[PDB]
Design a protein around this ligand. Sequence first.
Ligand SMILES: [Mg+2]
Ligand SMILES: [Mg+2]
Ligand SMILES: [Mg+2]
Ligand SMILES: [Mg+2]
Ligand SMILES: [Mg+2]
Ligand SMILES: [Mg+2]
Ligand SMILES: [Mg+2]
Ligand SMILES: [Mg+2]
Ligand SMILES: [Mg+2]
Ligand SMILES: [Mg+2]
Ligand SMILES: [Mg+2]
Ligand SMILES: [Mg+2]
Ligand SMILES: [Mg+2]
Ligand SMILES: [Mg+2]
Ligand SMILES: [Mg+2]
Ligand SMILES: [Mg+2]
Ligand SMILES: [Mg+2]
Ligand SMILES: [Mg+2]
Ligand SMILES: [Mg+2]
Ligand SMILES: [Mg+2]
Ligand SMILES: [Mg+2]
Ligand SMILES: [Mg+2]
Ligand SMILES: [Mg+2]
Ligand SMILES: [Mg+2]
Ligand SMILES: [Mg+2]
Ligand SMILES: [Mg+2]
Ligand SMILES: [Mg+2]
Ligand SMILES: [Mg+2]
Ligand SMILES: [Mg+2]
Ligand SMILES: [Mg+2]
Ligand SMILES: [Mg+2]
Ligand SMILES: [Mg+2]
Ligand SMILES: [Mg+2]
Ligand SMILES: [Mg+2]
Ligand SMILES: [Mg+2]
Ligand SMILES: [Mg+2]
Lengths: 82, 129, 80, 156, 122, 205
Amino acid sequence: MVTIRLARHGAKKRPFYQVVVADSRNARNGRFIERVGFFNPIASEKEEGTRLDLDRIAHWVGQGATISDRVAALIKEVNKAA
Amino acid sequence: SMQDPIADMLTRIRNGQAANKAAVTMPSSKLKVAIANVLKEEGFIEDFKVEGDTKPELELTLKYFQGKAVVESIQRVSRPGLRIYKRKDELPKVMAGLGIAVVSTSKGVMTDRAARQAGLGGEIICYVA
Amino acid sequence: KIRTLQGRVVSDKMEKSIVVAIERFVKHPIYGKFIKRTTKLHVHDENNECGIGDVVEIRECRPLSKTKSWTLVRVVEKAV
Amino acid sequence: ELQEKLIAVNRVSKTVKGGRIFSFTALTVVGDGNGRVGFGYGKAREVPAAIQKAMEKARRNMINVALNNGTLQHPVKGVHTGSRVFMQPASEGTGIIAGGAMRAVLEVAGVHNVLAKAYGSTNPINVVRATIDGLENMNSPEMVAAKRGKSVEEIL
Amino acid sequence: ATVNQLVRKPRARKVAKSNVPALEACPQKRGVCTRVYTTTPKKPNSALRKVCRVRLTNGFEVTSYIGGEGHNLQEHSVILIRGGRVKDLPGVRYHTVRGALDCSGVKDRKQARSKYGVKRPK
Amino acid sequence: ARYLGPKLKLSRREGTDLFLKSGVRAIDTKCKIEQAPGQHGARKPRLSDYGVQLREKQKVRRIYGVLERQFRNYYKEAARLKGNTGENLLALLEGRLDNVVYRMGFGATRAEARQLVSHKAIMVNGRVVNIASYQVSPNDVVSIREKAKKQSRVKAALELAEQREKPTWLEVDAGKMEGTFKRKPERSDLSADINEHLIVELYSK
RNA sequence: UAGCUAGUAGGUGGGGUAACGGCUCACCUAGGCGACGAUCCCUAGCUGGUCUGAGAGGAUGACCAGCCACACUGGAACUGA
RNA sequence: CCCGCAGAAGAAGCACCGGCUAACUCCGUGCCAGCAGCCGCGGUAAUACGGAGGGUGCAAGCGUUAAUCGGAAUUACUGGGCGUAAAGCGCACGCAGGCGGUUUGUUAAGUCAGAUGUGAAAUCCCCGGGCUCAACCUGGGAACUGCAUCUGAUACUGGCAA
Ligand SMILES: [Mg+2]
Ligand SMILES: [Mg+2]
Ligand SMILES: [Mg+2]
Ligand SMILES: [Mg+2]
Ligand SMILES: [Mg+2]
Ligand SMILES: [Mg+2]
Ligand SMILES: [Mg+2]
Ligand SMILES: [Mg+2]
Ligand SMILES: [Mg+2]
Ligand SMILES: [Mg+2]
Ligand SMILES: [Mg+2]
Ligand SMILES: [Mg+2]
Ligand SMILES: [Mg+2]
Ligand SMILES: [Mg+2]
Ligand SMILES: [Mg+2]
Ligand SMILES: [Mg+2]
Ligand SMILES: [Mg+2]
Ligand SMILES: [Mg+2]
Ligand SMILES: [Mg+2]
Ligand SMILES: [Mg+2]
Ligand SMILES: [Mg+2]
Ligand SMILES: [Mg+2]
Ligand SMILES: [Mg+2]
Ligand SMILES: [Mg+2]
Ligand SMILES: [Mg+2]
Ligand SMILES: [Mg+2]
Ligand SMILES: [Mg+2]
Ligand SMILES: [Mg+2]
Ligand SMILES: [Mg+2]
Ligand SMILES: [Mg+2]
Ligand SMILES: [Mg+2]
Ligand SMILES: [Mg+2]
Ligand SMILES: [Mg+2]
Ligand SMILES: [Mg+2]
Ligand SMILES: [Mg+2]
Ligand SMILES: [Mg+2]
């Protein structure tokens, strides 16, 4: 099942998430179909800290991809912000 | 046999300059005539002529400045054993641009500078310095 | 307007099949010399019309045998 | 104003009837740091006489080199006997990168920025001869344009 | 030399041969000492050089030079040998590491202690 | 990770004043400056080409109190950067926080400036910076922290900086004890007795 | 290491597979591969890359990611997308 | 991470010093003991062995061993040679192969130009951003020198015709 979720990158104690669309069976940092944004939960002020290509998200969701709950929260927060 | 006639011409130029000959002659061909035009336009030889109809003979008048040969080095690059073709971004420059490289492009034989300015690549006939 | 190859018939002994050589001209990776390389293909020719030496145009299709996966399109200069 | 460097000193022998007679040689290079560089050999029984004979010989037998802002005009190759030398211009601030014998001649001549490499025998005497020969056989845009009967920009 | 000739037979680098095959691409090797003895050197030098015959854990049997002044080694001593050959001593291509399992640091050394396994004097 | 040995020893070996002391005294009245250290100092050295390159590299390193591993990284950065490698290396060395605080005068020596920086007495852009090798940027404002402003060493250091030449590139207000690193210094702003080209070639080897 | 190969090369028909196919079988043709290195023997997981080098190259395939293979040894199927 | 307390208080070693290679004297020993990467040292003045003093190089590391590339143009495509240094078959004919005087036309295979698809992400490179700095992490780009398809050019090379 194609799903949109976060792949954890960065260093110890400083998580950086890559928002990727991928087959649900693969490893978390494993092979992914496409990269659609990034999420930074430690970003300081004046750094965006969250970027999502909403058009690609819409495209993949229209093809039937599911959405991880965390990235669903990100989409709502970004859509609320602007 | 004379497998490389263009090299023969360059060698005649080189040996004639070494021997301080006023002019040199060789059997003609349109490729040789086309290179001789490039040499004349670039000021490495004084002039050239073609003589005869059934067996045309090409004659080049060599060039000296301070009792010294204008052509210091002239070497064949692409040869029948190993052809060399360069793309537009790989066209060599000899002596950091002071000399010329004769390049045969789809629009006739010209210097490397002209071919680079025309955005073409081609076979590299020789380097002249 | 389809992808295709042209080659010469090296053998016609098999029934309904022929082997063609699709020799290509390629530069050597290291030395820079251009060298001829030959590739042999078992090709399918219904009507058993191709004789040795012919120049033929071939196209790639579904596997028709253990070693044969190309089919003849037309003979070029059938003269030998 | 002339700058001089001792490159190599060597002890030679003659093997006379009574035994070995030892004498010394010098190799020196002098230059103005602005395009004139000469080398002298110099041979004597004692090292000071040798270095002095070499310097005097080096002050004469000096040639002029068409430098370009402390850098070579174009890549050049120089070969004397068994030493082959390659020198090419480099950007400002690169330094003089070369073997010891070539280092001295290029420093003293005034080439501030050069990439150099020595192939074949690195015998100091022949390396210096080969690099000086290469530097002399290096022409400039003005002289090449004059030779070719054109202008500089027409050559660029 | 010709490109045609090279295409038919490419240039073929000579394979470098190691000088310490018994080590088998290892920094050190352990072994038991079959015989400890002293042998004479090559022509230019004159001395008694102390060497030991060592059977290594991999089957190889070699002769390893014992550096330093004085050693407490005999048959059945287990030692560590490292690469390196004592030029004027034919056949010897290894050095026993002093301060290893049973080789002991040379007594009363003050300079270059690390090479001879001597702890820092108080 | 630091040179804690005798300071004037280094100046004598290098044959020049390396500014390793405050300057209240003539260095020649403080040591035999024109003689090399040790038992064999009297001998004049006939050092070779590798010798002269090594001595120049050591001089620069001992001036700035930098160890070789860090210094080699500076060369790699300077080589990678666009422009003259030698002048880039000197710009990088000048940009160090310890050198900067010494230049504006909140410290008698680079070691004294280093202790002040190390003991959380220096702020850059209002943030206390404790790292000696911190690289300062143009328009940055380096200030002594409030609690350390009353240090008698800092006051005396300002007076000593008066006698030395004022650096052009950095503007200092002593009353506020704050300075602004206006721009990267050019080569002409730095001492002319540094032969940076020797260092560049020494790493070319 | 110079010859190797009889389901071997191809064809017709039947069966078989999710699917083309000597995948399998019967019959028929006598082919197929090889000096552009077949077959045989030794070594070996492959790649993005890593290290070195001015570059071209050379060595290499730890960590991280993609693909393959294996699961005490040999064989076999069953259940199931 | 910030603040307070106490007190320089709790915190420097390893290799090397004949030449290559930065750094030298004394004492011991006497071809012994030993050193050694190479050349070599040691036989009663040892800057080469052992200790000391002095010094040089690195530094929470410093040396030694192993292993790869470099230097090595010492497999040389870039970029070497073959009279005497290693190296021209004893000579010839000749198949496969490699190479091909000159002119015209055509073709468009090599070649060249453009476009399109792809060349996973990371890594390397450039400009930035975030950890007090750096290592590290991260945004965008360039690159991935390749392959395939399409459209054009006709000098050169190839094919075909004369
Ligand atoms: Mg040599
Ligand atoms: Mg071998
Ligand atoms: Mg450290
Ligand atoms: Mg059927
Ligand atoms: Mg069937
Ligand atoms: Mg099949
Ligand atoms: Mg295996
Ligand atoms: Mg394996
Ligand atoms: Mg190289
Ligand atoms: Mg490999
Ligand atoms: Mg593992
Ligand atoms: Mg399995
Ligand atoms: Mg097991
Ligand atoms: Mg099983
Ligand atoms: Mg199921
Ligand atoms: Mg089933
Ligand atoms: Mg010295
Ligand atoms: Mg020693
Ligand atoms: Mg003595
Ligand atoms: Mg020594
Ligand atoms: Mg000693
Ligand atoms: Mg090694
Ligand atoms: Mg090499
Ligand atoms: Mg040779
Ligand atoms: Mg002989
Ligand atoms: Mg011979
Ligand atoms: Mg003969
Ligand atoms: Mg013959
Ligand atoms: Mg022709
Ligand atoms: Mg032909
Ligand atoms: Mg084409
Ligand atoms: Mg990529
Ligand atoms: Mg930052
Ligand atoms: Mg990045
Ligand atoms: Mg044509
Ligand atoms: Mg043609």
